[PDB]
Design a protein around this ligand. Structure first.
Ligand code: HEM
Ligand code: HEM
Ligand code: HEM
Lengths: 215, 37, 31, 160, 29, 166, 32, 289, 160, 215, 166, 37, 289, 29, 31, 32
């Protein structure tokens, strides 16, 4: 119909994008272990999808949290599947990220001039682990609750700002409803935006500088 | 709670991956690719 | 009344602060 | 078969990149569609199918409702926090525990600024670095396994 | 009850003054 | 004639200094917002709660709740606290090591942490274990039928001098 | 609840011209 | 009357829908207005004016039937903590405006739900309320913020009594279908006027229907109308009107710091414009932009 | 004073842009720092200060707890949905109401494809378009005001 | 210290970014009304900040929602301020967006080749209004609850997929807890990501093509 | 020798066709997931709830809850429903126009919607108003002390033929 | 619930903005800027 | 014994901490294992093996003191719906493995909390449980998923009786501080052996302490030890051991569709690789990449 | 109980097969 | 046993499907 | 819960070499 493609081409400049994409090449030293970073991403996208899916039924309240997880597992169509996938992929993301760091280090890909990619990677690792710690306790079962009650007091050791930090994380003097609310905001709002930003930087630098050279 | 299946996949893949990283490195140590270094 | 006097006086004050800072900073070779 | 494009070493813009160790997407197998369009979906589907498989065969558990007045027997975080958890419980000095914990990411951040002393990428051309890495890896696995064991078997893995 | 009136006045003043400082800085409009 | 770098930088300080002032003014409420509100301590703490966060009564506790008194009760800051013919001091049940609740064992007259084998005394003092300090004490005064709890300001009842939580 | 509506409309409409006037004024005194 | 509200509906004069209970008996609707400050400082006395206007020259129907003037009444539901100001804190000017108004609570510990009984409409089409705002500083149940103010204002006689019997200030329909044969006007025990009316042309019941004089008839004689035709009219010239409003329990400290922040912003804006002015001269000189 | 840079009409890359109506960031007052760094913060602080001022002087209300068994008197959405709400309640045909509602964004989407018939930008050079816009604006304000009034005064604004 | 700036310059190429930024100019026809788009953004950033802030205390449950709003207004430090700002700025965003559309239309800036910017704008308007409708009911007061109970049945008019759509939006046959959960996910997860994506496209196209020409 | 465009496109269909198959397989559970679960209708609905979502009893309703019966009660699909010596049919209180709950007025023997002046009958039928259809009827059988409600499958009790909600 | 202050700011700014848009357009109709069109 | 658990702790054999109540009386700890399938289909009979191993050649102390062998016992807490399989559904092979085990519930409607009383340890270091999995298809309280399995396994005699009195299979300390002057060994009413021991060297109480024979003493005579020194030993050679496990109530349909999806994925991967193969030949020909 | 075994087998098979198809497609490793 | 036979048979089957599609598509001038 | 750990480790370790072998095999038959 009067060619739709040329229409989109004239104002989006699709051809330029196609030329940029097909101008890149992958050198021989790039082996299968160079997938690990992408697989870590794939795992995260699976988290993004299944996580979002679970926000339609999960309820971050001490009264309703546990039972909302029960409801997802028992009543919701394929709820058991979406949650089980979020669970396994949470662990597979961290695992693949570790293997990713093994590749990067045992290939010297972190050296000049790609050191901000490495630093942003470390930050990405701290964010990912934060995802894990906050999500672990959302069911508000014995395991999750006591995982929080232990770590939430650790920062108190810090001389001056220790008690303030701990109060900020747990939302008060002790673990309770406020703790669940803050952990939920962290898991479903703060950490997704942070990880997006630092993943953006990671990927922009990589695409900018290309892959590190052969060994 | 410790989970044997999960833990086994972790240790397993960590070992094959490290090993395979050193193997891949070795290959390029003996037969350097162009610009090898 | 108080609203009108306050409005005109507030704007007049800051218009005087604007002019004051203008010619004031000019004199000091800053502007 | 096996599409390849040689590095154009007559191109000074490419040479300037290589001089900064930064022109390695200019040569090799065409990234598109060879890898991106054909091989990437193999990796995406593969990893997705393994995760789904695990999810169906070994679905997620829901324990028992939290109880603030009853501390469980066996009280661990997730596996990737075992090393940190081991350190945290085994050190009498709480502040020193927090610092050791923080030293992990902060220490990793310094790596590139410490190993820039040379330009080698292959671990076989940097035996000192490779030794420190293998050491830390062994020490981390050690601390991780110790986390699941009683505090007494921690510094020995109940082996001696 | 005069502080209340000054309160609203300050709203009117920042509105007006914002307009004024954008006109001055951009030289018109 | 024309302002130099010295005067330009000075105008930068004056200008973006004021802008920075605006930013801090806007940031002040925000920082405080995230700091959790106080627990309405209009004295030094007060009520003690049961398991459902209701309220405890000595009319049902002293009456028929023990032939060998020693039961967990929501205490100060929500921390579980043992209440041992009422006793005048409460014992914080949170381990001093990492923070596990310490179960009581009458057969040995000691609290015994199940996490890493730590154990205490009949009054809440480390007899052994990886736990450094001891369980926190607190005032326990039965005013009204309900129980009132306040923080232990005075020196330790076990080791003479000042405590470690105040 | 109607004179307040008209008051707010007239003010949001007319205050703009006051700010416009003050802007032009400051432009005059600086030597545009 | 307002006191019949608290009799029949003791818990509150406001139904869950926001409907004020007067409407359950005062079935006509006329406009009611309110005048409250947008904001008030704590522990301060301010004016709350309820307005219940009607045509003063138009009279209404009295209990017997006589054409008489009408009275006004109102219920002012204030926010928690708010209540009628003590007499010793009401300035003289305000005292003069109020008049002989007998402010009384709707019930015990309901001091914010004020009520104002019958007042001569000719002099109280505009009722002034002296109200004292609470203080968050010495009451943990009270805090600064924006709260609703519910207002019901009536003029003229109602239509229903607390027992159920209808007043004479409403319209009267026909009992059943049949030919009217009676515009009788008898009486007996009590006093004043009354009317007897009946119908038939075959039916399944043999009784009549009396109408308390006051409205005025517009039916002559002989007519086989149905069950529901207006055989009187609507004498009612009054009616009840609702309104919601809002008041802000403001804190002087909030507004003060606001004024300061506003001033800081205006200063910053000035410094920015002047900075640009400097850069403009620099750009004009060293032509390089 | 007043920094300006003229369009370089000797530059064919700029001319090709202008030909596609697309080179208008190549000339004028320097965007940086003149506007971006100096004027933008004036607009940000200004709008922020007006919003904060309104927030303090006229803070947000919290009504009464929801009640599924008691429909309030006065039941409106927010102001920007008054026109749509007016249409929705005033049309007996529910389906036609939904379509009219959807027609708003879908209709706006078609605007550029309808007014590409010419290349004029100034409304004084496109009186037909300006007339249709002023008409719809008047009709929208009309529908919006009508929303707050009884259904009977809707098609007349209680004025005639 | 050995110049940190040159360090960041060599690998981030700061100079190139500075050259790109200082190569742009604003033509004379660009008047004050061309701020409206930016002010709409400013309003949104204020929403992003204050909204996030409120997720640390707000609880999307029929039992706790209303009271959590009470708690924010009465107990939380400056909670009344953050919420009042979210409220007024919610309305100022929509207002400024309307004025923004007035500028764009009465300047012909939507015509070739900037029509995808305009279409993405319309989508942005629908998203923004969706923000408003979902947030309006989060307090779960009379106003918010009945605002939902009315609109949630509107889509039923659609012949075949009407009832399905309505069930998806309200999370069931009628308005209740499920409705609040879905509306909260929409307001704090779905709509922020969507609006970010389409704002990204909006801004990328604008920066690509520059501002429309003089009138 | 070398495959042409016809065979390349065919291989594209075969390949990305299968890939598309994988995608649809993964999307099937996801689409269904968002579709809310059924309300456990193991019959045709059942219990009626009060204001707190508990349970209604005729022992306290018929006894002492009305000298002029007609009260709102959580009915099918959570919709508020009037229950008028029990009556055998319930009346859905949701307006037919936009969905406001319709208050009852005994003084006029009509339900009257306050939103736009719509009104109904003593049985739930539009006598006037902007509302097109009428209030939905439903079965009301007092089995046990509690009340059981099921959907009205049969034809309308007011206008002869089939209803509009089934 | 109708809010007079809000509603007044809406109508007000809508009117000054529309008016000012037509004014700005008019200015360029009589005195066309370079490339005016 | 297991039946003393349900006597003293009738509600459940599992404390809120997850501690199994045997430990309250069997104070020693020995390893206990479990063997359950990772997954089971609904309405299926499967094997659950509890293991309570100990040194068969090491004997323990009987109630009187005689050196006798020890018995085993256990509590198997299964998920809701799970219970001991009916005899008619247990295959022969399994029947032979079970033996003379008397499976009994912990209480009414607690069929998933199975218990197994005293069994000769020499032949039951490994107790087999025939258990039947429930079916979600005909029970709305049961659904597919992963659930916990709690297991307590003991061997040897306990240390405390349901009344409080200590058994003879534990250690005995000293009463108070003083010089031991008695290794007497008297008796009377009942039967068998007993020992009388006492102390003094000044004190604030004049009583002694008897120890039921069985343990064996390691104190001779004359020694001013304190209150708590071991004057016997620990005869206990048994102990209780806990374990948690998990079992998946799987659905055949889930796994079936899984197999199909997996197959679709592998097929797609093949087609992708082959497609690349085609493109490689095209690229080799028309050199342009 | 054979379907369960085939279930786990399919996991092992996609893991192995994914490796294989990446090696084949990328010509090594 | 059944696990080993199934694993080897599954991989063998799809390795046979791979080779089959390879030579099969070659024969049809597709590859 | 230990033989399952070792089983999973050995399988995740060894299955990789099986997939590697199958990949190389398919490479051989296509004519690398
Ligand atoms: C969610 C976490 C992460 C994701 C999604 C991710 C993603 C990626 C991706 C897709 C690549 C391209 C090459 C490859 O995939 O191997 C890459 C490269 C890289 N990554 Fe990451 N990564 C993450 C974490 C990390 C961590 C924890 C580190 C270091 C501690 C790191 C450091 C690097 C470096 C230095 C490169 C470039 C190396 C080279 O050019 O050879 N990343 N990352
Ligand atoms: C055989 C599979 C893979 C290999 C060999 C591989 C390797 C690489 C390489 C060499 C780069 C650097 C690109 C360059 O310098 O131009 C890279 C970057 C990247 N890859 Fe992968 N990867 C694989 C799988 C994946 C997958 C499955 C994803 C899924 C999203 C992915 C996403 C990315 C991203 C986001 C980057 C960031 C840099 C950029 O976008 O150019 N990769 N990877
Ligand atoms: C959250 C909503 C929106 C935001 C944040 C936004 C932001 C912006 C900004 C910052 C600009 C640069 C120029 C200016 O500010 O005037 C712009 C331009 C533009 N906007 Fe929007 N906008 C929004 C909604 C819309 C809508 C609703 C439309 C149309 C229905 C639209 C259409 C356009 C077009 C066509 C331009 C380019 C016009 C030109 O180049 O002269 N935008 N937008």
């Amino acid at each position: 119909m009067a060619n739709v493609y040329d229409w989109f081409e004239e104002r989006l400049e699709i051809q330029a994008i196609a030329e940029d994409v097909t101008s890149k090449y992958v050198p021989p030293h790039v082996n299968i272990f160079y997938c690990l970073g992408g697989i870590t991403l794939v795992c995260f996208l699976i988290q993004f999808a299944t996580g979002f899916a679970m926000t339609f039924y999960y309820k971050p309240t001490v009264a309703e949290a546990y039972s909302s997880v029960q409801y997802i597992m028992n009543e919701v169509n394929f709820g058991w599947l979406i949650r089980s996938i979020h669970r396994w992929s949470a662990s597979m993301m961290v695992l693949m990220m570790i293997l990713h760091v093994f590749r990067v280090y045992l290939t010297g890909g972190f050296k000049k001039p790609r050191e901000l990619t490495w630093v942003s990677g470390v930050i990405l690792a701290v964010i990912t682990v934060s995802f894990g710690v906050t999500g672990y306790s959302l069911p508000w079962d014995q395991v999750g609750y006591w995982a929080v009650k232990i770590v939430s007091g650790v920062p108190e050791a810090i001389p001056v700002v220790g008690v303030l930090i701990s109060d900020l994380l747990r939302g008060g003097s002790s673990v309770g409803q406020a703790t669940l609310t803050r952990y939920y905001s962290a898991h479903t709002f703060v950490l997704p935006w942070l990880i997006a930003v630092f993943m953006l930087f990671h990927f922009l630098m990589i695409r900018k500088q290309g892959i590190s050279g052969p060994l | 709670m410790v989970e044997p299946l999960l833990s086994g996949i972790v240790l397993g893949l960590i070992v094959v991956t490290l090993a395979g990283l050193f193997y891949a490195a070795y290959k390029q140590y003996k037969r350097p690719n162009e610009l090898g270094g | 009344m108080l609203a009108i006097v306050a409005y005109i006086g507030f704007l007049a004050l800051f218009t005087g602060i604007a002019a004051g800072l203008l010619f004031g900073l000019r004199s000091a070779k800053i502007l | 078969m096996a599409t390849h494009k040689k590095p154009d070493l007559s191109d000074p813009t490419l040479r300037a990149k290589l001089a900064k160790g930064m022109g390695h997407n200019y040569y090799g197998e065409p990234a598109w569609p060879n890898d991106l369009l054909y091989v990437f979906p193999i990796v995406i589907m593969g990893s997705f199918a393994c995760i789904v498989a695990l999810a169906v065969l070994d679905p997620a558990m829901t324990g028992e409702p939290a109880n603030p007045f009853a501390t469980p027997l066996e009280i661990l975080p997730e596996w990737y926090l075992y090393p940190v958890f081991q350190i945290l419980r085994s050190l009498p000095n709480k502040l020193l525990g927090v610092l050791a914990m923080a030293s992990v990411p902060l220490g990793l951040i310094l790596v590139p600024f410490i190993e820039n002393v040379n330009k080698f990428q292959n671990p076989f051309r940097r035996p000192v670095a490779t030794t420190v890495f293998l050491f830390g890896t062994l020490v981390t696995l050690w601390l991780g396994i110790g986390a699941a064991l009683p505090l007494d078997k921690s510094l020995t893995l109940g082996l001696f | 009850m005069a502080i209340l009136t000054l309160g609203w006045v300050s709203l009117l003043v920042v509105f007006t003054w914002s307009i004024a400082m954008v006109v001055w800085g951009r030289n018109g409009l | 004639d024309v302002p130099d770098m010295g005067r330009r930088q000075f105008m930068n300080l004056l200008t973006f200094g004021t802008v920075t002032g605006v930013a801090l003014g806007a940031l002040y409420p925000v920082v405080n917002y995230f700091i959790p509100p106080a627990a309405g301590g209009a004295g030094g703490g007060t009520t003690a709660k049961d398991e459902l966060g209701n309220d405890v009564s000595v009319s049902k506790f002293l009456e028929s709740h023990n032939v060998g008194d020693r039961t967990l009760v929501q205490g100060l800051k929500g921390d579980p606290t043992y209440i041992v013919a009422i006793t005048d001091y409460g014992i914080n049940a949170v381990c001093t090591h990492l923070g596990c609740v310490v179960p009581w064992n009458a057969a040995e007259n000691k609290f015994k942490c199940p996490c890493h084998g730590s154990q205490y005394d009949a009054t809440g003092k480390v007899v052994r274990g990886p736990a450094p300090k001891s369980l926190a004490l607190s005032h326990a005064k039965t005013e009204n039928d309900k129980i009132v709890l306040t923080s232990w300001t005075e020196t330790d009842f076990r080791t003479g001098e000042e405590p470690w939580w105040s | 609840m109607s004179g307040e509506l008209l008051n707010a409309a007239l003010l949001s409409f007319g205050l703009i011209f006051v700010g416009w006037a003050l802007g032009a004024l400051l432009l005059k005194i600086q030597g545009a | 009357y307002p006191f019949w509200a608290q009799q029949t509906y003791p818990e509150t004069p406001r139904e869950p829908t926001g409907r004020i209970v007067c409407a359950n008996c005062h079935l006509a609707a006329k406009p009611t207005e309110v005048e409250v400050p947008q904001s008030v400082l704590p522990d301060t006395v301010f004016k709350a004016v309820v307005k219940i206007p009607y045509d003063t020259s138009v009279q209404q129907v009295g209990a017997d039937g006589s054409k008489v003037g009408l009275n006004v009444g109102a219920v002012l539901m204030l926010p928690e903590g708010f209540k009628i100001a003590p007499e010793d804190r009401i300035p003289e000017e305000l005292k003069e405006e109020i008049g002989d108004v007998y402010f009384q609570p709707y019930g015990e510990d309901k001091d914010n739900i004020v009520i104002v009984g019958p007042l001569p409409g000719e002099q109280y089409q505009e009722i002034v309320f002296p109200v004292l705002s609470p203080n968050p500083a010495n009451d943990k149940n009270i805090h600064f913020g924006k709260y609703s103010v519910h207002v019901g204002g009536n003029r003229g006689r109602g239509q229903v009594y607390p027992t159920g019997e209808k007043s004479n200030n409403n319209l009267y329909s026909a009992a059943a279908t049949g030919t009217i044969s009676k515009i009788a006007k008898q009486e007996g025990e009590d006093g004043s006027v009354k009317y007897l009316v009946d119908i038939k042309t075959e039916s399944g019941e043999v009784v009549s229907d009396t109408i308390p004089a006051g409205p005025e008839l517009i039916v002559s004689e002989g007519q086989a109308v149905t069950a529901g035709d207006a055989l009187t009219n609507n004498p009612n010239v009054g009616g009840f009107g609702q309104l919601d409003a809002e008041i802000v329990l403001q804190d002087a400290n909030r507004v003060g710091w606001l004024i300061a922040f506003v001033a800081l912003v205006m200063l910053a804006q000035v410094m920015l414009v002047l900075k640009k002015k400097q850069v403009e001269k620099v750009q004009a000189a060293e032509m390089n932009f």
